[PDB]
């Protein structure tokens, strides 16, 4: 959905890049690894920047993996990560970019918001929603919903997959629920509040069936019980809100279905016995939901349009504005990254010249 200017790579290819041979840099890194010595962040950056073939991407993957297992792993500069994604997209290696993104622990790939949009858009342009879904999950794991452009792209892909998908596994419900709650809080509109309502319904279902621990374990979610309670609070907030905010009927139906399904139907207790369990509060939740549903319908706070239909209209109105802001900030990063790269090259050059002069004196 991103414009051609946003995904344009002319700016990236116009950087002042020093030409280096991959084999020479690969041989240099091998000698350092055998000596059990740290590898400079400049050396790995040159290796990534000098990728010129599809075959070279596989070789760079190993050294990127080895750099993650080096004492200087934390010094992996951001532009190297962005270049890595740019190289993968350039040589039709989207799977390689996704594989490192899934294995970010083993490779240290932590892209910024701008790069995540580029990777996500490539799957959307090719209608590869299966791979685009994983990218959204990676954003959910890395909590990269601070840019409105990423939030809009995530919502578009997530809602599109929800319509086709019918059977949900407990892991999938946790993933979809978490992946929708994060952008919903940022978006203060009808779609944003619907995502909060829809996301809480999926997470609340996991809490009662699979337990509270499964909700937040290795997830960016709170450990406090009451996901179903927070689902009802969204409806209460919409009930006292301007006419702009509305809740889609699809989200309301899903929450009602979850409550009815739960109503109809390792061993460590993580909650105090004095506190009321969420299972015992199910009849209370059902009574509250029916009252809120009638109140929202009476006030005309229910939107008849589907989630995908309303989200698509939302993208057409705000994506263009968000792209312009991201592009300008991306240009600033390129200027900032270029200055930092020069400093590292100068620092190495001064050290190498200083090392030789001291060696000559000795």
């Amino acid at each position: 959905l991103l414009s051609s200017a946003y995904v344009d790579s002319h700016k990236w290819e116009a950087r002042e890049k020093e030409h280096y041979c991959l084999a020479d840099l690969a041989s240099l890194m091998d000698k350092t690894f055998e000596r059990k010595l740290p590898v400079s962040s400049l050396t790995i950056s040159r290796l990534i920047d000098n990728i010129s073939s599809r075959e070279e991407i596989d070789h760079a993957e190993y050294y990127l993996y080895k750099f993650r297992h080096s004492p200087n792993c934390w010094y992996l500069r951001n532009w190297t990560i962005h270049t890595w994604i740019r190289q993968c997209l350039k040589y039709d290696a989207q799977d390689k970019a996704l594989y490192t993104l899934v294995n970010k622990v083993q490779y240290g790939i932590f892209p910024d918001n701008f790069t995540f949009n580029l990777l996500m858009d490539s799957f959307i342009k090719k209608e590869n929603y299966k791979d685009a879904l994983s990218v959204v999950f990676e954003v959910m794991m890395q909590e990269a919903f601070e840019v409105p452009s990423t939030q809009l792209l995530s919502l578009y892909v997530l809602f599109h997959c929800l319509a086709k998908k019918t059977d949900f596994s407990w892991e999938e419900e946790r993933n979809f629920g978490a992946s929708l709650l994060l952008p919903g809080l940022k978006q203060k509109n009808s779609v944003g509040f619907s995502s909060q309502l829809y996301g809480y319904a999926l997470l609340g279902k996991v809490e009662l069936q699979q337990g509270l621990r499964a909700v937040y374990h290795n997830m960016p979610l709170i450990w406090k019980p009451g996901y179903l309670d927070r689902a009802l609070q969204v409806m209460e907030k919409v009930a006292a809100s301007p006419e702009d905010i509305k809740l889609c009927r699809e989200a309301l139906d899903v929450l009602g279905a979850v409550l009815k399904a739960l109503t109809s139907a390792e061993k460590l207790v993580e909650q105090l016995d004095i506190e009321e369990t969420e299972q015992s509060k199910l009849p209370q939740y059902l009574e509250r939901f029916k009252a809120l549903h009638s109140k929202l319908q009476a006030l005309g706070k229910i939107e008849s349009e589907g989630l995908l239909s309303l989200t698509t209209q939302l993208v057409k109105e705000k994506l263009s504005t968000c792209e312009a802001e991201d592009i300008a900030t991306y240009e600033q990063n390129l200027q900032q990254w270029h200055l930092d790269l020069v400093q590292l090259i100068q620092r190495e050059q001064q050290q190498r010249e200083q090392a030789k002069q001291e060696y000559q004196a000795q």
């Binding site: 084999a23 690969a26 075959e55 070789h59 993957e61 190993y62 993996y65 294995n103 083993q106």
Partner: peptide, 14 residues
Amino acid sequence: QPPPKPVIVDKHRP
């Protein structure tokens, strides 16, 4: 999770 297999190809010097 198997580690990547190290593969080295030499073409700089014929």
